[PDB]
Coordinates of C-alpha atoms and ligand atoms in Angstrom, one line a residue:
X1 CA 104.8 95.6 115.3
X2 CA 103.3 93.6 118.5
X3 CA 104.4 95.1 121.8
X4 CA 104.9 98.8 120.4
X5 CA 103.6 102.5 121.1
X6 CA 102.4 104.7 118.2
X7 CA 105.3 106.7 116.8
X8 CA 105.2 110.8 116.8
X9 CA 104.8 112.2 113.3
X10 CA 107.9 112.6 111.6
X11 CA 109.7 110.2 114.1
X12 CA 111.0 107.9 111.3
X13 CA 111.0 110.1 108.3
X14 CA 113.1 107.2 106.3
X15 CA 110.1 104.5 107.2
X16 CA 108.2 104.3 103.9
X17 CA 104.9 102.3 102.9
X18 CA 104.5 99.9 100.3
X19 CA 100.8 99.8 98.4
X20 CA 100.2 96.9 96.1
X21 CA 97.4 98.5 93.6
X22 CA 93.5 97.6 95.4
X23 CA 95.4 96.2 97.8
X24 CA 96.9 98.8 100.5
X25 CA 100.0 98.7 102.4
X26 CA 101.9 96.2 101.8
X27 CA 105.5 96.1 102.8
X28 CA 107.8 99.0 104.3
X29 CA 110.9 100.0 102.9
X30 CA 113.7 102.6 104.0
X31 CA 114.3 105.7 102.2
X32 CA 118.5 105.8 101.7
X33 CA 118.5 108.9 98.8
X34 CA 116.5 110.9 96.5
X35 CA 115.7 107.9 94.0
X36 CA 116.3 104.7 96.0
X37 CA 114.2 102.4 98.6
X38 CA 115.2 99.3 100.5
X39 CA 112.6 96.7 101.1
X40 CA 112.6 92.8 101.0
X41 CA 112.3 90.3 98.3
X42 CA 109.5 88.4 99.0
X43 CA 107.0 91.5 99.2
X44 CA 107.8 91.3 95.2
X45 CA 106.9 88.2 94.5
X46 CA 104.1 87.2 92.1
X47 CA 101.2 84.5 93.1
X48 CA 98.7 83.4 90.5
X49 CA 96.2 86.4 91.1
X50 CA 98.4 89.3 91.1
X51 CA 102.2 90.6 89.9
X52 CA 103.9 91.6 92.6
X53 CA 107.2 91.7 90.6
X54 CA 105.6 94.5 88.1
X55 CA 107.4 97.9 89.4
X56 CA 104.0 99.4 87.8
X57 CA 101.8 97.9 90.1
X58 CA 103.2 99.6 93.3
X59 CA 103.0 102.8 95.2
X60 CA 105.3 104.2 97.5
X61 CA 104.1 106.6 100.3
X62 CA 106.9 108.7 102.3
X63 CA 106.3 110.9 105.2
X64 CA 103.4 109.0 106.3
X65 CA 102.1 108.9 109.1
X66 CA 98.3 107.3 109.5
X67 CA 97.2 104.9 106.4
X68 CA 93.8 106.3 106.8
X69 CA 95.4 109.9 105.9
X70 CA 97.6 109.6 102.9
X71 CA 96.6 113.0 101.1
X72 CA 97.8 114.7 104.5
X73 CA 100.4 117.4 104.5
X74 CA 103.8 116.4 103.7
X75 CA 103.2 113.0 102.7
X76 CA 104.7 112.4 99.2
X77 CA 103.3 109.9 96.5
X78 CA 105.7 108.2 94.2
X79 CA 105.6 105.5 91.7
X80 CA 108.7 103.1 90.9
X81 CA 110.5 102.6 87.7
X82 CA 112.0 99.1 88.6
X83 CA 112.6 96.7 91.2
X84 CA 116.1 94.9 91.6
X85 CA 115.8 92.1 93.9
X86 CA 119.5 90.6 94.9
X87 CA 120.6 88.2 92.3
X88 CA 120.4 85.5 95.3
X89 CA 117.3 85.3 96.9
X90 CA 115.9 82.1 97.5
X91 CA 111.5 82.4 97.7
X92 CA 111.8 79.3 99.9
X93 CA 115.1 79.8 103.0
X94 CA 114.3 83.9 102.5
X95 CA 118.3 84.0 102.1
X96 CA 119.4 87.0 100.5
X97 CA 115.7 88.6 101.1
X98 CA 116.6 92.3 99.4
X99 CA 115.6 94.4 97.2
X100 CA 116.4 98.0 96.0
X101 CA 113.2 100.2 94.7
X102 CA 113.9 103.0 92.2
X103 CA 111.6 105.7 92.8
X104 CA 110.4 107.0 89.3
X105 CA 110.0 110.4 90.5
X106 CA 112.7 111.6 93.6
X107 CA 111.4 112.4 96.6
X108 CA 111.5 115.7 98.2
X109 CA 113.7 115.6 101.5
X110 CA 111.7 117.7 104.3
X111 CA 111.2 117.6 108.2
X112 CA 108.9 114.3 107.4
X113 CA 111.3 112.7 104.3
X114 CA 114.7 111.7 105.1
X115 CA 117.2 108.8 104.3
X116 CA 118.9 106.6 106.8
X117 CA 122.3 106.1 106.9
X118 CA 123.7 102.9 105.7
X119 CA 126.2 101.3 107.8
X120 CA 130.2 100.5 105.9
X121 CA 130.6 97.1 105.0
X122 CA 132.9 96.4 108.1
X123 CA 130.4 98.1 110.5
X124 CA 129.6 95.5 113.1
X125 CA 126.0 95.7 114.7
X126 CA 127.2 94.1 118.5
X127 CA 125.0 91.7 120.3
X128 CA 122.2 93.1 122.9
X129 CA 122.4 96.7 121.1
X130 CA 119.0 98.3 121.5
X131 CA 117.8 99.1 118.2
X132 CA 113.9 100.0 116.4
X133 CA 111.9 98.6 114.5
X134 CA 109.2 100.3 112.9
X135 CA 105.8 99.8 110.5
X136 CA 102.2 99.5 110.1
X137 CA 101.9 95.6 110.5
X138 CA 99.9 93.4 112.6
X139 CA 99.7 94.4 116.1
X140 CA 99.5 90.7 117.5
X141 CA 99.9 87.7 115.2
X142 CA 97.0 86.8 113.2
X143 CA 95.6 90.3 114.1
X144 CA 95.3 93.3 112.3
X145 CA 97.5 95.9 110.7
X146 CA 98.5 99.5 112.9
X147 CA 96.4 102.6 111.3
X148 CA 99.1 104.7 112.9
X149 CA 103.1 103.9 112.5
X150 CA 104.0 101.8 115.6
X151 CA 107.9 101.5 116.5
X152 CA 109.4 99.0 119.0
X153 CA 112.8 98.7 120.9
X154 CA 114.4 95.4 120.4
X155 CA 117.8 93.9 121.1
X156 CA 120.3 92.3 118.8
X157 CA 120.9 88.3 119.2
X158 CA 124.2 86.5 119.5
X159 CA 124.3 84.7 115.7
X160 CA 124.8 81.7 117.8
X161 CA 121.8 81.7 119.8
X162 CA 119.9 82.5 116.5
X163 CA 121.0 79.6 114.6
X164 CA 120.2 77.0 117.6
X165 CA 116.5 78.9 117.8
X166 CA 115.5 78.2 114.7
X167 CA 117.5 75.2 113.3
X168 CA 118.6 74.3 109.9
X169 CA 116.9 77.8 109.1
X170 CA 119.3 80.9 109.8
X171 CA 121.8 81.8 107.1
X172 CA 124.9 84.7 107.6
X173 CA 122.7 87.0 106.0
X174 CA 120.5 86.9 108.6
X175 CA 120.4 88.0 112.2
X176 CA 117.7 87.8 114.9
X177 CA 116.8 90.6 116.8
X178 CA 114.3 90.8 120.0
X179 CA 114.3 89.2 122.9
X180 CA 113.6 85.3 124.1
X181 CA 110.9 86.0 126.4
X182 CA 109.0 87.5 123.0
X183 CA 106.6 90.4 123.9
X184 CA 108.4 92.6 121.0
X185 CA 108.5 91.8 117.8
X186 CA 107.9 92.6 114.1
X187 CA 104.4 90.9 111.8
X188 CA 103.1 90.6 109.3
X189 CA 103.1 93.7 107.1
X190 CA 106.5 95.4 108.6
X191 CA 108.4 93.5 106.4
X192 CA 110.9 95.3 104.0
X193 CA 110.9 98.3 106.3
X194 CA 114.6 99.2 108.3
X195 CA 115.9 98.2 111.6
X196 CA 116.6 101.9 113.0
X197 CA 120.1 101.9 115.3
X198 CA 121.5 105.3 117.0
X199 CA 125.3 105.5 116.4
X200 CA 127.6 107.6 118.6
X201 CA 126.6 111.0 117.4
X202 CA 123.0 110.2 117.5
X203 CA 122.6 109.7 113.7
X204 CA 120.4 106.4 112.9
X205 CA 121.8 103.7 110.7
X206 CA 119.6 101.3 109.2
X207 CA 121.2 97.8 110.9
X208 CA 118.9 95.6 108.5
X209 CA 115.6 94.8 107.0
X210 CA 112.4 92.7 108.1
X211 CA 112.1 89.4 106.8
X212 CA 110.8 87.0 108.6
X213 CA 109.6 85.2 111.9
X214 CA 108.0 82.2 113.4
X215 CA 104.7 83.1 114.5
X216 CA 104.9 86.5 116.2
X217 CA 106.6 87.8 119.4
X218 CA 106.5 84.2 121.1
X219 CA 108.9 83.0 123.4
X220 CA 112.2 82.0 122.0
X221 CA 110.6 83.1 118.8
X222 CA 112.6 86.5 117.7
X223 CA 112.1 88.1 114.4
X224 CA 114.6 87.4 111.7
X225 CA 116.3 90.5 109.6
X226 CA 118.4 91.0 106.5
X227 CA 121.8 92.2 107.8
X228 CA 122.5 95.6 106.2
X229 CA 126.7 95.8 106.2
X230 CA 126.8 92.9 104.0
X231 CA 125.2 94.2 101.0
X232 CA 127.0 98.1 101.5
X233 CA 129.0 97.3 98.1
X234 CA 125.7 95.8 96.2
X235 CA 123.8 99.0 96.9
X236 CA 126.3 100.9 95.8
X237 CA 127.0 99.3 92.5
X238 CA 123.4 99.1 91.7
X239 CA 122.5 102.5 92.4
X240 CA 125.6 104.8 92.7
X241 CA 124.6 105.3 96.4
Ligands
N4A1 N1 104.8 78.2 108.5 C1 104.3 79.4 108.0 N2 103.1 79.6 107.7 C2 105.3 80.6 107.8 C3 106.4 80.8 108.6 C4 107.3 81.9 108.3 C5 106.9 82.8 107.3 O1 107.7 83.9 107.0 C6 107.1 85.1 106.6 C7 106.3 85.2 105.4 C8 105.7 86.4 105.0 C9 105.9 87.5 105.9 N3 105.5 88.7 105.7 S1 104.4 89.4 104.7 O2 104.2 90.8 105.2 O3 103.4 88.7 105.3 C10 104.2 89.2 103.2 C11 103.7 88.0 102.6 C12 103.5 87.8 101.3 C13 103.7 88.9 100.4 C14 103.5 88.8 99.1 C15 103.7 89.9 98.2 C16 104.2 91.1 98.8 C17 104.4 91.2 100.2 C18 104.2 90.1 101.0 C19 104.4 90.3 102.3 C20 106.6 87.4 107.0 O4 106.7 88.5 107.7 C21 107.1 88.5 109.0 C22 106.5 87.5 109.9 C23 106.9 87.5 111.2 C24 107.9 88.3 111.7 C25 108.4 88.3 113.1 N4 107.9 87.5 114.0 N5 109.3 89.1 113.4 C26 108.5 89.3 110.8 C27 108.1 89.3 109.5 N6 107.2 86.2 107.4 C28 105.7 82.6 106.5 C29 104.9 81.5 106.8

C-alpha cells in the first residue's frame, strides 16, 4: 500500500497473508468462514522455478499483524487443501482474477480472526464511496514490502472513467478504485487481499480483490480490483458459503 498509515492490531481481522514456501508473504487473501479464503488468480500461478498452483506449497497466516512476528499471540498458522481458481481467468487480461483457498485446517474466529461480509449479488458498490484497502506490499513502487499491515482510504471510480484510463484493458469484472491524482494506491504484494467497505450499520463488506495496476499510485493511474457482487453465486456453489 503506497500512501497508507500502519494499521492497529486487530484492525482487519479478515486481512490474511499468503507465504509461498522460502519465499515469504506473498499475496493477501480475505477470511469469509471457518474453511474458506479469497485471493487472486495470478498469485497461483506457476513459473519455471517454482509451483505456485500446488495448494501444498502455501501457508496462510491469519491474525497477523508484523511479518517479522508470526509466532505472536493470536496469530494462527494454517495450511490449504486446494485452490479453485475461477474457471475463467485469463494469465494475460487478469479477467476473472479469483480464486477461493480452502483452509485444510479451520481457523479459530477470535478478537484478531474474523470473516468479512460478502456483498449479494445485486449489491451495488456506488461511485466515489470511500472504501480500504489493506496489506503488507510495497510501500512505493519498485520499493519494498510493509513489516507492519498498512491500510489506505481510496475512492470507487466511475466504470467509465476506468475503461478510458487504461484502454483496451478494463473488463466488467473489474473496477478501479483510488483517486486520479494517485498518492493512494495498492503494490505489489497486496494483491489477493479485500477491498474493506463500511455498510450502513457499520459492518465491513469486502467490495473486491487486488489485482492489478499500472505502475503504482501515479497520476491517472488507479489500482484495478476484482469486483466481489459478481461472483456472490460462484462462492457459494463452490464452498457452501
Ligand atoms: N508492464 C508491466 N511490467 C506490468 C503491468 C501490470 C502488471 O500487473 C500486476 C502483476 C503482478 C502484480 N502483483 S504481484 O504481487 O506482484 C504478484 C506477481 C507474481 C506472482 C506470482 C505468484 C504468486 C503471486 C504473485 C504476485 C500486480 O500487483 C499490483 C500492482 C499494482 C497495483 C496497483 N497500482 N494498484 C495493484 C496490484 N500487478 C504487471 C506487470
Amino acid at each position: 500500500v503506497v500512501g497508507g498509515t500502519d494499521a492497529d492490531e486487530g484492525e482487519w481481522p479478515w486481512q490474511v497473508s499468503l507465504h509461498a514456501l522460502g519465499q515469504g508473504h506473498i499475496c493477501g487473501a480475505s477470511l469469509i468462514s471457518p474453511n474458506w479464503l479469497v485471493s487472486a488468480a495470478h498469485c497461483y500461478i506457476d513459473d519455471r522455478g517454482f509451483r505456485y498452483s500446488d495448494p501444498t506449497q502455501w501457508t496462510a497466516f491469519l491474525g497477523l499483524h508484523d511479518q517479522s512476528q508470526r509466532s505472536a499471540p493470536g496469530v494462527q498458522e494454517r495450511r490449504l487443501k486446494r485452490i479453485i481458481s475461477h474457471p475463467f481467468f485469463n494469465d494475460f487480461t487478469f479477467d476473472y482474477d479469483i480464486a477461493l483457498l480452502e483452509l485444510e485446517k479451520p481457523a479459530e474466529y477470535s478478537s484478531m480472526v474474523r470473516p468479512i461480509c460478502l456483498p449479494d449479488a445485486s449489491h451495488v458498490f456506488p461511485a466515489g464511496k470511500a472504501i480500504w484497502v489493506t496489506g503488507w506490499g510495497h510501500t512505493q513502487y519498485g520499493g519494498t514490502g510493509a513489516l507492519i499491515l498498512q491500510k489506505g482510504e481510496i475512492r470507487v471510480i466511475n466504470q467509465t472513467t476506468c475503461e478510458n484510463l487504461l484502454p483496451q484493458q478494463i473488463t466488467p469484472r473489474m473496477m478501479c478504485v483510488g483517486f486520479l491524482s494517485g498518492g493512494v494506491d495498492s503494490c505489489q504484494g497486496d494483491s489477493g487481499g479485500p477491498l474493506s467497505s463500511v455498510e450502513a450499520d457499520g459492518r465491513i463488506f469486502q467490495a473486491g480483490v487486488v489485482s492489478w495496476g499500472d505502475g503504482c499510485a501515479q497520476r491517472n493511474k488507479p489500482g484495478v480490483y476484482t469486483r466481489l457482487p459478481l461472483f456472490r453465486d460462484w462462492i457459494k456453489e463452490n464452498t457452501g458459503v
